[PDB]
Each structure stands twice: as C-alpha cells, then as structure tokens.
C-alpha cells in the first residue's frame, strides 16, 4: 500500500490499547508526528506468534531471510496484534501460506512468488515432487485452541522513503496564527515567499 496526498495522524494509531507488540526503530516514537517524509509504504502480512521476534534488522532464520529481508538502514515501523478470533477457525483450517525453501538469499524489499520446486541434488525431476525435489510452500499451524506462541498476528510494516520530493504526507500544524500587513514568510504549498 502507498500513502500519498493524505494527511496522517498517528495518535489514533497508538491509543487503541489493543496491540500486543510494537517495534518502531529509526525514529523516536514520540516525535514522528512532527517530522515528515515523502512516501509511507504499508506492507501487511500474517505470521505466527513465535516468528514476531525474527522481524528485526540483523536477524537470521527461516522466514525473514526468505520472504521479507530487513536491511540495516531500516526506518520502518512494525505493528502487530492478536486476531485469533477472526484469522483462524475450527476444523484445522489455516488459509495462509509461507515459503521455506530457496536456492539463495534475496535482496530486501523484494517479493518472491515463484512456485518452482526447489531442487536439492543434481538430478532434475522435471517439475514433480521427486527425490531431492521438495515443494517450497508449506502449511500453517493456526488453531483457535492453541496457546499464545503460535497465534495469528497481523504484522504491518510502515516504512519511510528518503528522496527529493515535497512532503505530501505530513503531520504539521493545521493552522498557525494569521498575520497581515507585515513582511512575513509563508509556505502556501507552492512557494517560500517573504512579503506582506
């Protein structure tokens, strides 16, 4: 998701008092409303309760290094919460998919949708689940009767972009005092002019 030409208030996003976890690096959480950037990227995905610790800059595992890499210069903001009452149902239903097998590492902020069967040995299988040829897509373990470590958590990543553009998405003051008949400086979305 891309946020553009919209004013955003992050105070309502914090006063919900329902999120289980909140990790927000790069910028201090109390002073990100006044500071503004150009574009805000929202990446939403589901994950298990034991893999929420893997989502951090400088971690190694089986999900972060194969699905969504976190670089060292990660100024994103991670929000997740417990949604077991809606994302899971009885009957052993999961309705979500992950990737476990890959040939090598991938670049950060890259989406991998390849369904090719990962070959382990030197013998090709011609696209079947033969020996040394395992499908890289596996089933979840979501269940409403589990505990707290395997629950469905909806992780959203709110990253920021550093590039030359006027701040379309920002949290500034809505209206300062209005002064007339004196030589003042104003910024009315198109100029930096000093005059009466």
């Amino acid at each position, epitope marked *: 998701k891309r946020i553009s030409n919209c004013v955003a208030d992050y105070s309502v996003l914090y006063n919900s008092a329902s999120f289980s976890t909140f990790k927000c690096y790069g910028v201090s959480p109390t002073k990100l409303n006044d500071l503004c950037f150009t574009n805000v990227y929202a990446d939403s995905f589901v994950i298990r309760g034991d893999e929420v*610790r893997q989502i951090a800059p400088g971690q190694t595992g089986k999900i972060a290094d194969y699905n969504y890499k976190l670089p060292d210069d990660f100024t994103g903001c991670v929000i997740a919460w417990n949604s077991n009452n809606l994302d899971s149902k009885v009957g052993g239903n999961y309705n979500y998919l992950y990737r476990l097998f890959r040939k090598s590492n991938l670049k950060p902020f890259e989406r991998d949708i390849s369904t090719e069967i990962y070959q382990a040995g030197s013998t090709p299988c011609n696209g079947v689940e033969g020996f040394n040829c395992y499908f890289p897509l596996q089933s979840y373990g979501f269940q409403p009767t589990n505990g707290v470590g395997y629950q469905p958590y909806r992780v959203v990543v709110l990253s920021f972009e550093l590039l030359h553009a006027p701040a379309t998405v920002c949290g500034p003051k809505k209206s300062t005092n209005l002064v007339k008949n004196k030589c003042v400086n104003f910024n009315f979305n198109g100029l930096t002019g000093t005059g009466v």
Partner: antibody, heavy 120, light 110 residues
Framework: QVQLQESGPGLVKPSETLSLTCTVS??????????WSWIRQPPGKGLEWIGC???????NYNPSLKSRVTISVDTSKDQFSLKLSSVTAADTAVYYC????????????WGQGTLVTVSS | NFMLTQPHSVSESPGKTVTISCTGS????????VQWYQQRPGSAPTTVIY?????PSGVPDRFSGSIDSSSNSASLTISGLKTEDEADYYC?????????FGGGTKLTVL
C-alpha cells in the same frame, strides 16, 4: 518546565478508602493527548505499577490490583486523584504519581514520593 | 503472567564494565520496549535509558543497552563505574495493557 506535587494524608488506616491526589503545575492535563499513571514502591522492594489513565474515561489496572483502584481526573483543577479500597498492612509503599507520554515507553518526569504507612 | 527476571545484587570494582540482565518469562523482550530506571535511595526515580539503544540527554555515554531476543534477556552494559552510580536498577515492560517492572538490581558501593 512542569512539575508534579502530591498531596493527601500520608498515613493510612486499615480497611478504609485511601485518598491521594497529585497536582500538576506548569502545564495542562487535557492538552497534548497526555497520559497519567500511579506507581508505588515498598521500602526495600521493586517498583509496582498500579494503573494508568487518560484525560478521558479510558483507564487500565493491574490484575493484582484489579477492582480496587479508582482513579479520576478533573480538568478544572488540573490534577488527578487515586482512590484505593480495602487497604491492608502489605500496602505500605512510597507512592509516586507518574508523568509519562508513551504508554509503552518511559516515565520521564517523576514526582516526589509520599510515605504511606499504617497509622498507630 | 509475564514478568521481568532481574538479578538482586551485582558488585564490581570501579573503572570496569558490568552487564545487568532483565529476563522475560513468557513474552519476548523484542515484543515491547524496555525502559531502565536509576534511583537514588530516598528520592524519585530517573530514567537512565529508553528505546533500548539511545540515551536521554543528561546521562553520560557509558549507559548502553543491548537486546538479544534469542535468550529473552534485556541487557544493560555499564562501563567506568563511579561513586554516584550506586543505585537500584529496574527494567520496565508493557506486556498487554499492563506495565510490568523488574525485580531490581541494587548496584553496590564502588
């Protein structure tokens, strides 16, 4: 800047209704979208979280202290007060009214600690 | 049922480096922010570090915190011990709408 001052009777009677009020001078309770909380600390023991409040009716309490903490905020006098029920001899602790902005963060400003102990 | 396990007594000579741990039982340390507090005996507590990697304006650069989510123990590395550093140290968490503090590490004299 801003400072926090506590008031109310320091000594506490057994099995009664505690009344401690924390006042704020140099700022406004309602402005800034600011939270308020109370923290007690027994002598020789660690800090214990009692509860936190907003300038609206939103509040949360420790499950160990649940259904015993009653905290209210009045904007006209610019202060917030806490009421404790069924106080015992194990509740003798140094009470701090806590100034904090981030609910998951830190208590940047701390008021002076009032000594609360069973009366003789 | 989430608590922060903290050592009771930590004692070292001045001028060296120390490590103070803060272990979470159920919830992971990387789930929520951890705040450390330094309090003189008989006074109000003061925040010595917060956000797990950055120092507030006023404290020296010797107060450093590190997080290793594999062992679920919040670490606070303090180097160059002085006279004024003798205090109790408490780590803070949030869990889920319920602020949980640490056991307390009374940093001894010298």
């Amino acid at each position: 800047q801003v400072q926090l001052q506590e008031s109310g009777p320091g000594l506490v009677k057994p099995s009664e209704t505690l009344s401690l009020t924390c006042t704020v001078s140099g700022g406004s309770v309602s402005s800034g979208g600011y939270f308020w909380s109370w923290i007690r600390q027994p002598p020789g023991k660690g800090l214990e979280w009692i509860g936190c409040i907003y300038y609206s009716g939103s509040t949360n309490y420790n499950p160990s202290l649940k259904s015993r903490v009653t905290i209210s905020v009045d904007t006209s006098k610019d202060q917030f007060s806490l009421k404790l029920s069924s106080v015992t001899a194990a509740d003798t602790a140094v009470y701090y009214c806590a100034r904090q902005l981030w609910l998951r963060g830190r208590f940047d400003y701390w008021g002076q600690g009032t000594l609360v102990t069973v009366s003789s | 049922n989430f608590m922060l396990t903290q050592p009771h007594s930590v004692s070292e000579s001045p001028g060296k480096t120390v490590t103070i741990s803060c272990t979470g039982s159920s919830g992971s340390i990387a789930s929520n922010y951890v705040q450390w507090y330094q309090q003189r005996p008989g006074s109000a507590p003061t925040t010595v570090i917060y956000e797990d990697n950055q120092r507030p304006s006023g404290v020296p650069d010797r107060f450093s915190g590190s997080i290793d989510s594999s062992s679920n123990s919040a670490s606070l590395t303090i180097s160059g011990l002085k006279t004024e550093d003798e205090a109790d140290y408490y780590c803070q968490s949030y869990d889920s709408s319920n602020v949980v503090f640490g056991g307390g590490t009374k940093l001894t004299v010298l």
